[PDB]
Design a protein around this ligand. Structure first.
Ligand SMILES: Nc1nc(N)c([N+](=O)[O-])c(=O)[nH]1
Ligand SMILES: Nc1nc(N)c([N+](=O)[O-])c(=O)[nH]1
Lengths: 261, 261
C-alpha cells in the first residue's frame, strides 16, 4: 500500500504496519522564564506518552521568544526520549532552529502558506513536513473540493521549494477555518484526501466540534475524540494527533486489526 | 432510510435518528435464592444505564429456574425504568414468560435454531426478535457467505412461524462460533449484512477477540470495544449491545453526527 517508509533521520516510520500515534506535548511555560520546571514537565510528559504508545512527539511554541521556549524542550526530549519529534510551527525561522535542535518533522498549521520559506527549510534539512488545510476565512464554495484545492496549493509551494513527495504529509485541518457542521462534513468525506496520493494525519483531539455534538467540556471529550480517530483510520489516515495517547493507541490498534492494517 | 419504526408496545424506536444503545444488565444472582438484593441491584443498574443513554435494557437468565430468576427482574425493571426490555434467551418457554412479565424484544443467541418455537412465541406476542448468527461449529467454507446463509436460515424459521419482516433484527454474532481472526473478518465485512434488508445489532462489548488484539483483561477493553462500536456504526448497524453505556453512548452519538445519521 505505501511503497516507501517515512524517513526521519535516525528513526523510520513504516506507513503500512499501523496507525502512527502523534502525542501532543503540553508545553505549559514558566511565568518566570528553558527553565527546569517547564523542560522537566515536558520530558516527563513525553516519556509518559512514549510509554503509552506514541510514535512521534509533537512539540509546539514573538518569534525569537518562540525559539527560546521550544528549542530547549526539543534538546531535552530528543536526548531523553527515543522518538521522532515534529515541530508545531508555521514560521520558517522557528522550524530551522527546531530541526537544528533535534526535531525530525515539521508540523505546519498553515501548509507553507503563512511563511513559504518553511517549505524551503523542509527541502534543505530534507525532513517530512505536514501540510495542514487552513485558510483565513470560511467562504467555501464546496467544502471538500475547496479543501483538496487549498491542499494542492500547499503541495505546489512545497514541491516548488524542493520538497520530495515522500516528505509530504497532508492534514485536513479539522477545527481550522471550518464551522462545526463543516468539520463533521470533512470527517464524513475524509477518504477524498487519499486521491492526492499522500499520507494523511488526522488532528481532532478534544476539539470544539466534538463538544458541539456531545455538549461536553474539553476534559470530557475522550469518547468523542475516539469516534473521530476511529472514523479517520477507517477512512485511510496514516497518523492521528492525540492528547490521550494511552486510550487512542488502544483504539488505533483495534481499528488496525479490524480494517486489516 | 428505514421506512418504519421499531414498535415495542408502549415504546417506539426510530431507526434513523440515532444508533440505539442496548445496555447489558448484570444479573448477578443471589446464592441464597426474585430476592431483594439481586432484583434491587438489577433495577439500580438499569436505572444507571437509562441515565447514561441506554435505549433498551437487555436482561439475561434449568429452564424453570431460569424463568424464576429473570421474570422478577423484568417485572421490577419494567415498572421502574421506562425503557424497552429485551429478553436474552434462546428458549421458547423462557421467552413466553418474559414478554408476559413485561419484556418487549426477544434476544435469541441461536437465531430461532436451538428452539424453533421461539419464533412462534415472537410471532404471537408480535415482538421484535433479534436473530443472532451462531453455529455449533467453525467449519466455514466462506465466513461472510456462510454467515449470511446461516442468518437467512434464521429469517426463514422466523418468517415461517409468522414473524413480520418489521420485527426482525439481525446480529452477526461476534464472539460466537468464530475464531479471533474470523471475528475481525466479520467486523471488516459487517456492511454485507445490510443486503438482507434488516436492522443490524452489533454485540462486541468486552469480548475475547478485543483482548486477543490488545492483550488486555476484560476490564481494560473499553477502548477496543469503542473501536468495534465505531466501525459497526460506520458499517450501518442500527443498535450496539454494550456494558459501558455512558462511554458507548457518547461514542455512538459522535459517530452519528459524523456519518450523517
Ligand atoms: N497537523 C496538525 N497540527 C496542529 N497543530 C493541529 N492542531 O489542532 O493544533 C492539527 O489538528 N493538526
Ligand atoms: N444479540 C446478542 N445477544 C447476546 N446475548 C450477545 N452476547 O454476546 O451475549 C450478543 O453479542 N448479541
Amino acid at each position: 500500500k505505501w511503497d516507501y517508509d517515512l524517513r526521519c533521520g535516525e528513526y523510520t516510520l513504516n506507513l503500512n504496519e499501523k496507525t502512527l500515534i502523534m502525542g501532543i506535548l503540553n508545553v505549559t511555560p514558566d511565568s518566570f522564564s528553558g527553565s527546569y520546571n517547564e523542560v522537566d514537565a515536558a520530558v516527563r510528559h513525553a516519556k509518559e506518552m512514549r510509554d503509552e504508545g506514541a510514535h512521534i512527539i509533537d512539540i509546539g511554541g514573538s518569534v525569537e521568544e518562540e525559539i527560546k521556549r521550544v528549542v530547549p524542550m526539543i534538546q531535552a526530549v530528543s536526548k531523553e526520549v527515543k522518538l521522532p519529534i515534529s515541530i508545531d510551527t508555521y514560521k520558517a525561522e522557528v522550524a530551522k532552529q527546531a530541526i537544528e535542535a533535534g526535531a525530525h518533522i515539521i508540523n505546519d498549521i498553515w501548509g507553507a502558506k503563512a511563511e513559504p520559506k518553511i517549505a524551503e527549510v523542509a527541502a534543505h534539512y530534507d525532513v517530512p513536513i505536514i501540510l495542514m488545510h487552513n485558510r483565513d476565512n470560511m467562504n467555501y464554495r464546496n467544502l471538500m473540493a475547496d479543501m483538496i484545492a487549498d491542499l494542492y496549493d500547499s503541495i505546489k509551494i512545497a514541491k516548488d521549494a524542493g520538497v520530495r513527495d515522500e516528505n509530504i504529509i497532508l492534514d485536513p485541518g479539522i477545527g481550522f477555518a471550518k464551522t462545526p457542521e463543516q468539520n463533521l462534513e470533512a470527517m464524513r468525506n475524509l477518504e477524498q484526501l487519499n486521491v492526492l496520493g499522500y499520507p494523511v494525519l488526522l488532528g481532532t483531539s478534544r476539539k470544539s466540534f466534538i463538544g458541539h455534538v456531545l455538549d461536553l467540556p474539553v476534559e470530557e471529550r475522550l469518547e468523542g475524540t475516539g469516534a473521530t480517530v476511529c472514523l479517520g483510520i477507517e477512512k485511510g489516515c496514516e497518523f492521528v494527533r492525540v492528547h490521550d495517547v494511552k486510550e487512542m493507541s488502544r483504539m488505533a490498534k483495534m481499528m488496525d486489526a479490524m480494517i486489516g492494517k
